[PDB]
């Protein structure tokens, strides 16, 4: 489904607060 | 998580929620506790941004 190779898809699996003023 | 633990502290007072201190102490007398909460939070902001 994504435009990535088999090596790029293998390493992707390994890798309330905003209410207090911690926006992301 | 460090800034989360600082909000629950009293910083020398008896409570941490601003809606609890004003409900039991009048602003003319609660000024000695609100100033400690603001100053005690400015130290965590300067440390976090550093």
């Amino acid at each position: 489904p994504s435009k990535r190779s088999f090596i790029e898809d293998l390493l992707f699996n390994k890798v309330a607060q905003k209410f207090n003023g911690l926006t992301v | 998580n460090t800034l989360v633990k600082q909000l629950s502290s009293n910083f020398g007072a008896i409570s941490s929620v601003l809606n609890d201190i004003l409900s039991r102490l009048d602003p003319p007398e609660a000024e000695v506790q609100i100033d400690r909460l603001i100053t005690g939070r400015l130290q965590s902001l300067q440390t976090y941004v550093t």
Partner: protein, 99 residues
């Protein structure tokens, strides 16, 4: 007398009102006040308890002293205001962006 150490049983000359949901109005349960939207919560508490905290040590849900139900607290203070302008030389029109 103590403050916020036992369920309400004394209180004073304060009459109770109705219960409104899906609104970001103020609330008061056993002296503890706050601001948040009272919605539904699938989690249940314990019969020998009342208040409830979380990971951030905040009041997320408080048991009602009448219906004895579970209502989650969600403050509506969540959002920001932004504006993008292409410049005062091109045109005098902007676009309000919500965070």
């Amino acid at each position: 007398f103590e403050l916020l150490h036992a369920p309400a049983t004394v209180c004073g000359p304060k009459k109770s009102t109705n219960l409104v949901k899906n609104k970001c109005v103020n609330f008061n349960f056993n002296g503890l006040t706050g601001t948040g939207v009272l919605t539904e919560s699938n989690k249940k508490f314990l019969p020998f308890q009342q208040f409830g905290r979380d990971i951030a040590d905040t009041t997320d849900a408080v048991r009602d002293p009448q219906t004895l139900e579970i209502l989650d607290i969600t403050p509506c203070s969540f959002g920001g205001v932004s504006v993008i302008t292409p410049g005062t030389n091109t045109s005098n029109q902007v676009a309000v962006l919500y965070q």
